[PDB]
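hey team, just a heads up i'm posting the complex here instead of the shared drive bc the drive is being weird again. everything in one block, sequence lines first with there labels, then the predicted structure for the whole assembly after. its two chains so it's a bit long, scroll down
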Amino acid sequence: RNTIHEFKKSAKTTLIKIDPALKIKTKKVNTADQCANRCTRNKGLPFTCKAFVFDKARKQCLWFPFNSMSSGVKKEFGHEFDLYENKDYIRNCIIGEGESYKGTVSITKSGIKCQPWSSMIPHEHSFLPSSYRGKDLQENYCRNPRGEEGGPWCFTSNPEVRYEVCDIPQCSE
Amino acid sequence: RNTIHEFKKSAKTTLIKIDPALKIKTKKVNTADQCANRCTRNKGLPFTCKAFVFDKARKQCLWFPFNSMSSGVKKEFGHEFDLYENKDYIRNCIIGEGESYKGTVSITKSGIKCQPWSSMIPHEHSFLPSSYRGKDLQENYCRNPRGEEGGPWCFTSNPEVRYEVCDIPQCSE
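-- predicted structure starts here --
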């Protein structure tokens, strides 16, 4: 099985450590699948593998014990990098109204698949990543970029349903 | 692609709905992979698929808008049943010291693969599911069955290291 699809992918991105005390392991490989497989199994890493980057140029994995939401870690844009975050370390429940939610649930509560944020079909809208930097309006993930009440939501791919809330649990239970 | 391995599998287990109003969807297939593909892609399902069960006698998927932790639903035994739970709806962060943690993390903070609980190798112990019922000492997941200071831990597959705490973040972080 290919463990690559079990990760949250963010194209053209890598991560940089502000605090350089945080450990890292690198290696040249061929495909990103190799980085995924290694990371998932965690065999060969003196730490818990939370995320990795595949350098497409150098053909190289960079395995991290941290991810984009870790303190003292910055995202950086780069044409050759693909970021892959292990979903186990992307909080899959919400605090409050869920403005900080970054998980990959992309289905509404009646079970309609979400429309991508940067598509205008079926529904036209202004909720684009450029209007909400840091709110992760990517793919078709359930989000609440304005921090409104009702929790994370999305435009549904049902022409007859403009938007619907998603059913994402609170961490409080 | 093959999604079945993206679920927490509980063997010999099904879920009975106690709440009379609760939705359930079922169909006859050959293998459980079919149930998993259907669940993940959430296709032809009037709810959000949080878990399914494969009946090996009937050769039949049962899809659920709930899982084993949902209120109004009971875990129940049967040799013919296998319970697959969508990892997006098992809290992946710990509240307090982690006694209620039911996630699938199974690596110690220093990268060691956990020894399965019901194994005696490399390390003999007494943390058997049969004397910790309710605490999900299954497979080799990090657990904290006595709710001790230190959070979830496991016995490790490394003969040199009996046990190690795991690195599972607090929901508030």
